[PDB]
Amino acid sequence: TAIEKALDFIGGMNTSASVPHSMDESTAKGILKYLHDLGVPVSPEVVVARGEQEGWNPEFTKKVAGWAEKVASGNRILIKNPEYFSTYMQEQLKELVLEH
Helix, strand or coil, rough: CCHHHHHCCCCCCCCCCCCCCHHHHHHHHHHHHHHCCCCCCCCCCHHHHHHHHHCHHHHHHHCCCCCCCHHCCCCCCCCCCCCCCCCHHHHHHHHHHHHH
16 A cells, blocks of 8 residues: 555665654655645554554654654645655555555
């Protein structure tokens, strides 16, 4: 599913870092905002669950979960360099959502 693939992308980032790198932040936020706009939100709990499972840096999980919370709040979110969330990733997620 789109949500599972989204979590995979995030899992392929530098999950070990306490403070996510700029590319990772921009890309993680992009993924979250995009899926939420598509009607398939990624809840902060599905994020935390994933973070605990794969054993990411808990501080990293906290950040990704906090971004998913801002997205889920319905408010706008600042994404510094949005281009890092590639067209490949976007079209892949769009494809998975539509096939459901």
